[PDB]
Amino acid sequence: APPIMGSSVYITVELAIAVLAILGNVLVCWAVWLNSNLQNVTNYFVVSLAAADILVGVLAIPFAITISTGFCAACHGCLFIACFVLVLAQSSIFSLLAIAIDRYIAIAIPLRYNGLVTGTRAAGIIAICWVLSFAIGLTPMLGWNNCGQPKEGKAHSQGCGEGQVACLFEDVVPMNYMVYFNFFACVLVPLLLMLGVYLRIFAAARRQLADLEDNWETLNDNLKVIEKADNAAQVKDALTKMRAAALDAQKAHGFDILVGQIDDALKLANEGKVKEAQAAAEQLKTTRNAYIQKYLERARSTLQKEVHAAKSAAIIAGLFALCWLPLHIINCFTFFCPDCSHAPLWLMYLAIVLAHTNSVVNPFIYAYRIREFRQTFRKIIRS
Ligand SMILES: CC(C)CCC[C@@H](C)[C@H]1CC[C@H]2[C@@H]3CC=C4C[C@@H](O)CC[C@]4(C)[C@H]3CC[C@]12C
Ligand SMILES: CC(C)CCC[C@@H](C)[C@H]1CC[C@H]2[C@@H]3CC=C4C[C@@H](O)CC[C@]4(C)[C@H]3CC[C@]12C
Ligand SMILES: CC(C)CCC[C@@H](C)[C@H]1CC[C@H]2[C@@H]3CC=C4C[C@@H](O)CC[C@]4(C)[C@H]3CC[C@]12C
Ligand SMILES: CCn1c(=O)c2c(nc(/C=C/c3ccc(OC)c(OC)c3)n2C)n(CC)c1=O
Ligand SMILES: CCCCCCCC/C=C\CCCCCCCC(=O)OC[C@H](O)CO
Ligand SMILES: CCCCCCCC/C=C\CCCCCCCC(=O)O
Ligand code: NA
């Protein structure tokens, strides 16, 4: 068929994706810029990622449309057209890894997270990540390209001038770079690191929930022990275990009452006043129902929240992988199997369109899983 027809379908889909990418990610940026409840370190990496997607629509997709035509161009200019999307993809990877690490710090060490992770260092990290993304993505421009061995015939058939080439991705970008350097080292390794980080996150959260329920169970079971005890030494056993568990749970003003009441009962148990020690320990039920239950519930709620936020971040990371892996896998076949027939052109553009689609989904994930983003989107739209 006349190449323009299939091209028209590919171009039309690309432009539609560009519109949606720009609109959605501009909305994310606007939401963070207005709402102070969304202005944190985590959402600063979210904005860095949104900027990458905005640039995908404004530059990467136009570049992709351009390089699909095979227009005559200087090989190094064609190279920039081809590799700029690699810059944006690498920036996305760094932002995703930063979010994963930020969440891990938030749950692993909630105490020092406020001082360890701050917005100033975050801005510096984002800057560095963009510089390294330009370095990685544009590494072919430094010499790892196929400009030294142009396809002279394909340049003459299209009437390209002296020093020009038919600007085609696989003609100028080496495939060993895309497979070994870009995919394996710069895409797959970071993603597997993110996987390990999120496993540590969820493992931690599960362990802390188990610790909370364990401390609640021990506090009630030793209460039963104190009830049915028969001598002062046994009451002392249960209470000593209690006191340690109390100063323990305090770490991860009502507790003051608790530990104090344990001390009262423990002193009276040391005086051989068994009976009055169970009464003094039975006072603990009051402190538990009014103070230790509320703490258990509030803490469990906060950890469930951290799990939810981590799940949202992992969803976006996984969607990034889902959208980009097909193109990388096609490159692996093009590189590792020269005996295989190259992936058909329609499948190539389907994979490119999918990678680009990734720049549209993140705003939707925010709106469907994060209430603050959802409500801010609503306010912006209604106005
Ligand atoms: C800040 C933003 C808006 C600036 C964007 C500038 C972009 C579009 C510019 C910067 C460098 C430019 C390229 C430089 C050299 C060549 C080789 C030539 O044979 C064809 C055009 C081509 C491939 C240019 C296309 C346009 C280009 C990519
Ligand atoms: C999916 C995540 C976990 C890891 C990525 C796995 C990738 C690197 C794997 C999955 C399937 C693999 C391909 C399966 C089959 C072939 C055909 C063979 O003649 C050359 C190697 C090649 C082309 C493999 C290269 C590596 C490959 C693309
Ligand atoms: C869900 C994501 C992560 C994985 C998707 C895997 C996709 C990209 C895989 C599944 C089957 C694969 C195809 C299987 C066979 C061939 C024929 C060969 O001559 C060229 C490559 C080509 C056309 C492969 C391209 C990549 C392919 C389409
Ligand atoms: C690094 C991410 N990536 C890619 O990895 C990539 C790609 N285009 C191709 C390949 C395009 C292509 C391959 C064979 C063709 O003809 C046989 C062809 O003709 C238009 C285009 N590849 C491998 N693009 C879009 C510019 C891309 O972004
Ligand atoms: C901040 C927002 C600003 C918006 C910025 C707009 C986005 C860039 C658009 C297109 C770049 C790709 C188009 C490059 C086409 C080159 C065609 C050309 O030069 O053709 C000559 C021919 O090949 C003889 O050799
Ligand atoms: C945000 C949506 C994007 C809108 C911007 C317009 C898209 C531009 C894309 C491609 C322009 C084609 C450039 C001309 C290449 C030379 C063609 C040739 O000589 O064969
Ligand atoms: Na992205």
Numbering used by the authors: 0 to 208, 1001 to 1043, 1063 to 1106, 219 to 305
Describing publication, verbatim:
The cardinal combination of microsecond exposure times, innovative beam characteristics and adaptable sample environment provides high quality complete data, even from an exceptionally small amount of crystalline material, enabling what we collectively term serial microsecond crystallography (SµX). Here we describe the first comprehensive application of serial microsecond crystallography (SµX) at the new ESRF-EBS beamline, using sample delivery methods already established in SX - fixed target, either on foils or Silicon (Si-) chips, and HVEs.
After validating the use of different sample delivery methods with various model systems, we applied SµX to an integral membrane receptor, where only a few thousands diffraction images were sufficient to obtain a fully interpretable electron density map for the antagonist istradefylline-bound A2A receptor conformation, providing access to the antagonist binding mode. The A2AR receptor is involved in a variety of physiopathological and neurological disorders, such as Parkinson's disease, Pain, inflammation and cancer and represents, consequently, an important target for drug discovery. To maximise the hit rate, we used a 15 µm spacing to ensure a separation larger than the beam and the crystal size. With only 15 μL of crystal slurry embedded in LCP, pooled from three syringes, we could get a complete dataset at 2.5 Å resolution with a well-defined electron density around the ligand. The resolution allowed to performed automated docking and the ligand was placed automatically using phenix.ligandfit with a RMSD of 0.26 Å from the refined position, calculated with DockRMSD46. The ligand is anchored with a polar interaction with N253 and stabilised by pi-stacking interaction with F168 and hydrophobic interaction with L249.
